[PDB]
Design a protein around this ligand. Structure first.
Ligand code: POV
Ligand code: POV
Ligand code: POV
Ligand code: POV
Ligand code: POV
Ligand code: POV
Ligand code: Y01
Ligand code: Y01
Ligand code: Y01
Ligand code: Y01
Ligand code: Y01
Ligand code: I8E
Ligand code: I8E
Ligand code: I8E
Ligand code: I8E
Ligand code: CA
Ligand code: CL
Lengths: 612, 612
């Protein structure tokens, strides 16, 4: 807001103090004849610093003024060593600038003037941020490599440019090229810069150097969705075994893709990132064949078993709620509006007969089953990234919120049964609904409508937490009208609107056409009802056909196939969670070993494919 | 109708009187040998004027007869000075014609015959109108420039063609080129004609000369939706500050785009025009970045505050209507069809207890709030273009009609309470509905379904004020049938149709399936009912599935993305109204100044963008 406004005030102040100076102006427009006049006249202030803290040499280099920049370097050689001093462009020298503008003849000069190639452009304008349109890094080489100047990138290496130099974020130049928008020019520079990693004594060669998040360039390529570079960095891991005409048997490596157990593997990093370009990586030729093997072999069995153990558990919860304790009421009917006939038994008479002891079994089976839920779900939360990283791994798993809410209500139900509290129907009735509707989750195993509850969970897009605001306002408006219309009338005839809370429920039901329009026809209703209700039935009918449309254009001219892509992302998110929770004995590690084959101690995957 | 018919009768009469003349015919077909015979024979009527008032020279020039036209100019030189005299092609000379037909060798001659280049083609066929297929202006240069003849446009300037000459509408030649259908040939002529604005003493140079609507060529380009020329006229306003490799920092001017406060700025002229090509301008690179800054900074706050102050106001109106004065009725039940139990209290007993004084507070809060509405909305109307320009600024604001109707009903409610009038439910029940459903407007702030109440307000297209005619006819037809079928029967059994007004309401409800089909089954209904109602349920079911379709094809094969364009047009229309109503202190002017930067007294905007 104001910081963006404060950039502008400096960029204009920058152009102001150029005009308010004879030196900084002559550099901008390359008036050498009027520049020699100024440098010769007096041992002037050559350290004139404009708004961004920049000397005349920055400005000669910022506007591609080769001829001006030499004169500054001839007059006072101290200028090449001068960085900008402002908080915005801090540390930046004239060398960084000439590289970005690709001024080949100027950059050669500043190196001939022994300019530092290790100078670190720390300013805020270079850090990675959506406020900045560029992330070229922090060093001259990182700037050269991202503008695609093969010549300058070489030229800086003869002068001692450490390729292993990292940013504040730890990203060496190999990470940055993955973060650029132009992919095709970035793969060619990736190859060139490793070629200058010649010397055998390097202690974790460049493409295995992680940043301050632990990510290598390979894993960074997946998190950012750079499909081009993920492929290009993958031929280092292939090993073509044999080729028999149209057949090929490649042997992928999977050391950074498969869950080892020490650091989060690439499949965990693609699910735990907000981007949707990263989910394209799950279609690539080493990964697609691994996800479909964890699942087809060891992910559908352990998910269509724990989806049937849950069903036989909720069927036991259910029968413990149908057959609950209930006795005839002991009070008397207070008002004629009280049709309560029964109330729930106290403990001393709830468990007093054989049929109530079969139930106690099922009720202990239940509440033990709810504690278990809170011992395999809450310890994840309380130990893991309690609320930010939890829902981050969640792609289509609101399940984990509901089933913890299930187990909570079951325990509320227990306590209330122990202290003989009135109102056990309130917790149960949540637990029933939350308990069964979680069985909608144990469906994706077979490609049920679980690939299509992707929709109803994708249907927490805009027009379904947002059509509330323009439906609820209709309900509150006509319900408050309907109420005052029948506020004078006899409710034993038409009693849809006898109190304000029932006027909203009735009006909610009338919006959806799940009760019939009020009518008696043996009594004169108000004339002000039929006018009002005719409009409600119209606003309600049209708002239920702008949303059918809105749910359509957000599905057909918009996404209908990335839902099939979203399925493959839930197959992973499921597979990862099971492999994290289930023990190693039930989960054989995917891929074949290498110790008994001479390939090392890595865990390869073989893929046999036909070219054409 | 008849005026178009009267053009034709002259165009045929024009060809008639050519055939009924030996002179006008010889010109049409270029018979010089039979033309010299006619001019030499006798000092003839060379002033023969056909239907449109045209002499032989117009016709030689209208049909590209170079050889005939010279003979007329050699015989009698007085012809070049002769305009057409008819009301349709008034003022037009032979010079105007040769320019349009691009006859390069003929036009040189008429200038050699000292023909006026200031002659003003005033006729109705040249004025701007949908009845005319061309608007080439009123002068020879304006005709040359719109046919794209670089040669003739130059050639008229050596002979003294004032470029600053304006039409009856004030449009100089620079405005006209924007109004042409061919854009690409018009940008090149725009450049050429300013080049001939050399002399420094001009007193508002050409591209700052307004027409009789005050619009300059820049502002005219936006009103007309000429995206090509809006861009082309915008490089005069850019000022590229610096270029750092792929980065560019341009400094746009915004003097004619932003609301200064003296004349309506370009953002006000694009909303207040009926065209939809003009709304394309809101996506261009100086304007898109300004709308999104007024809003993101100073338009969502002042719109999500006055949208919550309104909600707490209607919640107070509501509670003042639930808790209204009501007492048991004093009369007796007239007929058994009267289930009115209560009636409303008189003033003397309406405010008699502490609970009725808390309400008086909320009722004064209310009616003060309705006067305020009528002091910030009616003074706009009564002062502004009361009914034509009001709804012109309205793009998606029927809100302004409803909220004035709200405040009116609240004051009707007041008066009726002061004079103890019966029927306060009628005004309230409008005010409730109009009051809440206006909260659907204070939603666009967050990109609610307010971008999608664009639909339901776009849904006042054809098939929703127009499907009425083919639904209402079904209702009136079967309701008048249902009525006469049960006009003989006992209504205490089936009384959906006991009077004609309830027969239309019931039938309205049955069309929409918001009440159940009539039935008793303990009594023999007419056989003529089941035949009729079976057809109604079919016509009703099919007419509710031709419109689902009609609302679809008008959304999916038709517009689904210009609604996203329509949002950005309401962001402006909202932003303009707030900036007009709210004071200057709460509204800092957008864009940075120039006085403290040497750029002048203009109000620039900086945009930093990455090329590729
Ligand atoms: C974790 C370890 C334990 C934690 C603490 C344990 C708590 C222990 C104590 C709790 C409550 C205090 C004692 C009982 C109150 C009696 C007063 C009364 O009249 O109650 C009435 C209402 O019912 C209630 O008031 C019961 C409240 C249910 C639990 C809290 C709400 C949970 C859902 C909140 C929403 C969350 C949203 C979730 C969204 C998914 C009685 O019920 P009734 O229906 O009026 O009529 C009888 C019904 N019956 C005869 C048919 C059966
Ligand atoms: C701005 C400054 C002030 C202006 C002048 C102030 C005017 C002052 C005086 C006005 C009316 C004259 C006195 C009362 C008439 C009594 C006769 C009678 O039987 O009435 C009946 C009908 O109700 C009416 O006749 C009331 C009329 C309401 C106001 C006018 C209509 C506004 C909406 C028009 C549409 C516009 C379309 C809008 C589209 C959005 C009585 O009501 P009831 O329902 O039959 O039964 C009682 C109801 N109750 C007990 C439940 C409460
Ligand atoms: C996105 C989803 C939104 C939420 C869903 C929204 C819909 C539903 C949600 C919530 C509605 C809750 C209303 C009922 C609770 C109030 C008290 C009550 O029960 O009735 C009392 C009256 O109370 C009133 O008259 C106050 C009603 C004012 C409006 C309340 C909603 C405010 C907006 C907030 C929501 C923003 C909505 C979004 C758009 C702005 C008593 O009534 P009674 O017993 O008949 O006695 C009457 C007295 N008499 C007999 C003397 C005459
Ligand atoms: C469009 C804008 C809004 C329309 C009118 C605004 C409102 C009306 C305007 C003003 C107030 C009413 C007039 C004075 C009193 C008359 C008698 C009366 O109150 O009610 C009587 C009949 O009602 C009528 O005879 C109403 C006559 C008005 C026109 C009919 C409205 C419907 C048609 C237009 C439809 C438009 C769509 C048509 C198709 C496109 C009986 O009704 P009640 O409730 O039994 O009365 C006694 C109640 N009490 C015992 C409690 C006392
Ligand atoms: C775009 C939206 C259009 C508007 C909505 C359209 C639908 C609704 C709008 C309006 C309908 C209004 C009808 C009711 C008012 C009339 C009087 C009345 O109430 O009943 C009286 C009878 O009256 C009649 O019998 C006359 C009905 C003739 C047709 C009226 C509509 C004309 C078309 C105009 C519209 C063009 C529609 C467009 C297509 C052409 C009395 O009835 P009763 O009390 O039972 O007494 C009967 C006497 N008996 C007992 C002796 C037997
Ligand atoms: C398609 C064109 C239109 C159809 C026929 C046109 C009309 C009929 C033609 C002519 C008039 C009726 C015939 C004479 C009198 C018979 C008895 C009578 O009136 O009603 C009796 C039964 O009704 C019948 O028995 C009707 C017999 C005709 C054929 C059945 C029609 C439905 C089938 C075809 C469906 C087509 C779709 C099939 C699937 C595609 C009893 O009825 P009521 O009302 O209780 O009578 C007493 C009333 N009163 C006490 C007031 C006196
Ligand atoms: C008390 C004893 C004798 C009987 C009750 C045992 C089972 C019938 C219940 C109680 C514990 C339950 C489990 C506890 C928690 C979970 C984790 C949760 O599964 C997942 O989160 C897998 C999907 C994913 O992680 O994406 C929901 C099912 C499951 C296996 C439950 C399935 C049903 C179980 C095995
Ligand atoms: C007493 C209860 C029944 C009152 C009304 C229900 C509410 C308590 C709401 C709050 C949140 C709702 C739940 C939110 C999300 C879902 C997931 C949805 O299922 C899925 O998307 C697939 C299953 C999964 O992913 O877990 C089914 C409806 C359900 C259970 C909803 C059911 C109704 C709930 C429990
Ligand atoms: C009597 C006092 C003590 C309390 C009542 C004050 C407020 C709760 C009310 C009454 C005056 C109302 C305002 C009067 C008129 C308007 C203009 C109108 O807004 C617009 O037209 C903005 C959108 C646009 O112009 O496109 C509707 C809301 C607003 C600000 C109203 C919002 C709610 C306000 C501030
Ligand atoms: C006593 C009343 C309730 C009888 C029936 C209602 C009618 C008086 C009609 C006449 C015009 C209608 C209104 C015309 C347009 C709109 C805007 C529409 O909202 C929007 O398009 C967004 C809000 C806005 O832009 O103001 C919601 C329905 C509503 C309020 C309509 C509600 C019903 C109204 C008030
Ligand atoms: C909206 C388009 C697409 C279709 C046309 C529908 C409406 C404009 C019409 C159809 C019939 C009309 C109704 C016919 C009769 C009445 C009864 C009238 O009240 C009375 O006559 C009181 C006494 C009684 O109802 O017997 C109030 C207006 C109302 C509801 C009318 C309101 C407007 C309605 C719903
Ligand atoms: C989308 C616009 C909603 C709308 C606006 C209306 O004006 C009306 C509506 C619906 O339905 C009918 C025609 C039945 C009403 C009749 C009575 C009144 C007072 C109003 C009519
Ligand atoms: C703006 C007022 C006119 C109008 C036009 C309509 O097309 C419709 C209106 C009202 O309300 C009802 C509910 C009667 C129609 C039913 C059929 C459909 C799907 C649309 C509805
Ligand atoms: C779009 C055409 C509407 C239509 C036309 C009809 O001919 C009939 C219709 C509907 O529905 C059935 C078949 C139930 C009627 C049975 C009775 C009569 C007398 C007619 C039948
Ligand atoms: C022309 C007469 C034949 C006919 C054909 C139909 O297809 C339909 C007809 C009538 O009416 C009903 C309402 C029974 C059908 C219901 C299902 C749909 C959506 C269409 C309706
Ligand atoms: Ca029903
Ligand atoms: Cl559909």
């Amino acid at each position: 807001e104001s910081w963006a406004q404060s950039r502008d005030e400096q960029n204009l102040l920058q152009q102001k103090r150029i005009w308010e100076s004879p030196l900084l102006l002559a550099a901008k427009d390359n008036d050498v004849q009027a520049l020699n006049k100024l440098l010769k006249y007096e041992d002037c202030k050559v350290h004139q610093r404009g708004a961004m803290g920049e000397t005349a040499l920055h400005i000669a280099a910022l506007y591609d003024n080769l001829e001006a920049a030499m004169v500054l370097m001839e007059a006072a050689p101290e200028l090449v060593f001068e960085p900008m001093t402002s908080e915005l462009y801090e540390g930046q020298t004239a060398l960084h600038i000439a590289v970005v503008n690709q001024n080949m003849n100027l950059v050669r000069a500043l190196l001939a003037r022994r300019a530092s190639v290790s100078a670190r452009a720390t300013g805020t304008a270079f850090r990675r941020s959506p406020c900045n349109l560029i992330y070229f890094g922090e060093h001259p080489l990182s700037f050269a490599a991202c503008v695609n100047s093969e010549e300058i990138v070489r030229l800086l290496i003869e002068h001692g440019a450490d390729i292993r130099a990292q940013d504040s974020l730890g990203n060496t130049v190999l990470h940055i090229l993955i973060l650029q928008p132009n992919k095709t020019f970035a793969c060619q520079m990736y190859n060139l810069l490793l070629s200058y990693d010649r010397h055998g004594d390097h202690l974790q060669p460049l493409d295995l150097v992680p940043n301050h998040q632990g990510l290598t360039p390979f894993k960074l390529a997946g998190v950012e969705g750079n499909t081009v570079m993920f492929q290009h960095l993958m031929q280092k891991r292939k090993h073509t075994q044999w080729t028999y005409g149209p057949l090929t048997s490649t042997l992928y490596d999977l050391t950074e893709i498969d869950s080892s157990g020490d650091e989060q593997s690439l499949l965990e990093l693609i699910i735990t990132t907000k981007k949707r370009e990263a989910r394209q990586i799950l279609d690539q030729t080493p990964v697609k064949e691994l996800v479909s093997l964890k699942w087809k072999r060891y992910g559908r069995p352990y998910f269509c078993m724990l989806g049937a153990i849950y069903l036989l558990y909720i069927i036991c919860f259910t029968m413990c709620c149908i057959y609950r304790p209930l006795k005839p009421r002991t009070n008397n009917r207070t008002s004629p509006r009280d049709n309560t006939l029964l109330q729930q038994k106290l403990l001393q008479e709830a468990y007093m007969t054989p049929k109530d002891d079969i139930r106690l079994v099922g009720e202990l089976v239940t509440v033990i089953g709810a504690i278990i839920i809170l011992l395999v779900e809450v310890p994840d939360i309380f130990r893991m990234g309690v609320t930010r990283f939890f829902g981050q791994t969640i792609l289509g798993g609101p399940f984990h919120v509901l089933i913890i809410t299930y187990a909570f209500m079951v325990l509320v139900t227990m306590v209330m049964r122990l202290i003989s509290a009135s109102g056990e129907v309130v917790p149960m009735s949540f637990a029933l609904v939350l308990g069964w509707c979680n069985v909608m989750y144990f469906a994706r195993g077979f490609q049920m409508l679980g690939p299509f509850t992707i929709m109803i969970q994708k249907m927490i897009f805009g027009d379904l937490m947002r059509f509330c605001w323009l439906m609820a306002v209709v309900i509150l408006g006509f319900a408050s009208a309907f109420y005052i219309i029948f506020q004078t009338e006899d409710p034993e005839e038409l009693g849809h609107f006898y109190d304000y809370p029932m006027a909203l429920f009735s009006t909610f039901e009338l919006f959806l056409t799940i009760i019939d329009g009020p009518a008696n026809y043996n009594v004169d209703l108000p004339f002000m009802y039929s006018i009002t209700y005719a409009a409600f039935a119209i606003i309600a009918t049209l708002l239920m056909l702008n949303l059918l449309i809105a749910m359509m254009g957000d599905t057909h001219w918009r996404v209908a196939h990335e839902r099939d892509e979203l399925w493959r992302a839930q197959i992973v998110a499921t597979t990862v969670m099971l492999e994290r929770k289930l023990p190693r004995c039930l989960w054989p590690r995917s891929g074949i070993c290498g110790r008994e084959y001479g390939l090392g101690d890595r865990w390869f995957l073989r893929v046999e494919d036909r070219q054409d």
